[PDB]
Amino acid sequence: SMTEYKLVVVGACGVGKSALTIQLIQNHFVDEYDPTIEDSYRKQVVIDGETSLLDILDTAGQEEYSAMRDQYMRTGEGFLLVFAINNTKSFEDIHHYREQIKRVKDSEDVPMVLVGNKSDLPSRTVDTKQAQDLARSYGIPFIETSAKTRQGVDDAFYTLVREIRKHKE
Template sequence: MAEYRLVVVGGGGVGKSALTIQFILNHFVQEYDPTIEDSYRKQVVIDDETCLLDVLDTAGQEEYSAMRDQYMRTGQGFALVYSITSRESFEELRAFRNQILRVKDRDQVPMVLVGNKVDLEGSRAVSQEEARELAISFGCAWMETSAKSRVRVEDSFFALVRAVRQDEEASAKPSQRRRKGKAKCAIM
């Protein structure tokens, strides 16, 4: 069974834990309790393939930034979460992405941009258009969710797994092509 290590990142108070717990346990956490780091596992079927998801819910607060390099190094896919009610959380995403790319030493890493708290539409501070444009510039999918109302929560994690699968397939192909082109020799 395939196993995927997914990391949920974003600023403090954007709903990373609420999204993760809603996905894993089908439960909405009302109170805000800043996370240091929590890990959850869940077996799911995505596109007719059973897989095990290891989801790491991370600290958004700046005082825990020293821990980020470690979990970014081990993560395969990243959910970049912001609150649609917080412009600051949206503007922080570029720094999170840049840190991930630096730690992974790659130009592209599987990611999904997740705008959480769509149940608070009346307090929206980030337009769908600018979020869509940022996702295009990052080369990743984007969707809006509500951990409270369970809107597109599962979709966001499944989209991230699909991005990881595409990345794995793309990185496997060049090595297969190289092998086909190599000359073979026989020692007699």
């Protein structure tokens, strides 16, 4: 029976969580996807020759950290930490999201990938060397993406599936 991986896309408002997920699922760039809508999506993929089913949660909509919600997020097997390269606050919010995840999972090894989205933009305020360095300190992979041009979208998600597989090993 084909393996199921539950992936959670996290990051500040407007970083591109919805546009990344819609590119992976529908291969189309949405620029007006309702910001409050928190939906999940299923996609059958072949990664390194093994077929699997991804269940992908695109987080949305401001809410306080509750206990019920903690238990819902505990079911995530892997987390995409998304910042935008032209949003210093989005980059700064990464540590906060990683700790919340370390907390609910009650564990130091959680499968995670750092994603710097909007790499198509010319106005970059977060240097590639800064994000590499952070990812090295977490010991997680770092991918630069553009949901707009589709550069790196599949690779960010499939890098996370590979982190989950190694974890399960």
